Specification:
- The structure is a homodimer.
- Chain A has 4 helices and 7 strands.
- The first copy, chain A, has about 160 residues and is an alpha+beta fold.
- In chain A, β3 (about 75-80) and β4 (about 80-85) form a beta hairpin.
- Chain A is globular.
- The interface of A and B includes residues 49, 54 and 63 of A.
Chain lengths: ~160, ~160
Amino acid sequence: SFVDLGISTQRKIVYELYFAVKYLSKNKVGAIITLQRNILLDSLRTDGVKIDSLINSSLLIAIFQKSSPLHDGAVIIVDDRILYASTYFSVSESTLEDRYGARHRAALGISEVSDSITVVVSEQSGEVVIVRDANFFKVTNLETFTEVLTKELNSSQT
Amino acid sequence: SFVDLGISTQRKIVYELYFAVKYLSKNKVGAIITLQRNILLDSLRTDGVKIDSLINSSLLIAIFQKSSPLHDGAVIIVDDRILYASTYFSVSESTLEDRYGARHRAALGISEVSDSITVVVSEQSGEVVIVRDANFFKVTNLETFTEVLTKELNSS
């Protein structure tokens, strides 16, 4: 559903996510941002706060600060809106409760049951990955981010 | 404006604001939340981010955390939505016999130029005030907050 938006809207989403990721990665702030595409994620949602806001780098940075009520769980972006924050899913990979690898596992789970793209920033290393269909594209150079993410969002869907 | 919303919506709004303010007061986190009424505030504020979000206590708490980039400056609510965050009012109000907090100053200033209703939580004391028409009701027992605010929202 990203592919159906005007080029201005797509470019906005990518740039805002870019600024957010630059901050989060540099300061080693964990985050899970999931862009839903054609498979609607609402069916698989366990918990989560619905905020239905415009997507914005500053709001994202606020959401994922350690002292924030919304920094655990996943943000779900639908078209150009942050629909949910602190979202969890009943996928069968995020059933471990071990902290290490938790967001990577949650992202993998989501990617296995939907065509969604999921950016993950690691609280430990600040490393950034783009998770899609059980693959982890590791973004070692953040100045490739906008390009990589764009390709991911325009790939073949379900 | 607000009375045109619906009892479910009005109660939900005041309830979410209540939980936000309860948390913010307990932890002495400064905050300023301006519910716009008939005077459009756009000409009177500068800067800020337009987020156009639902009104949610958790979101508000996240916005006003001291490590949050949106915590300095005021939230502006319109109808049932957080329109702006970390926006700055170009106006303040002082008096002779008091010198309290910059958020209190800004909220009284904004009530001088608009019919808006502003909730302020003091960074130092955690004390909650509600500001309208250059006056400020003090809400020292937060169980009354839900009542007090609704009164103020159903005014002139």
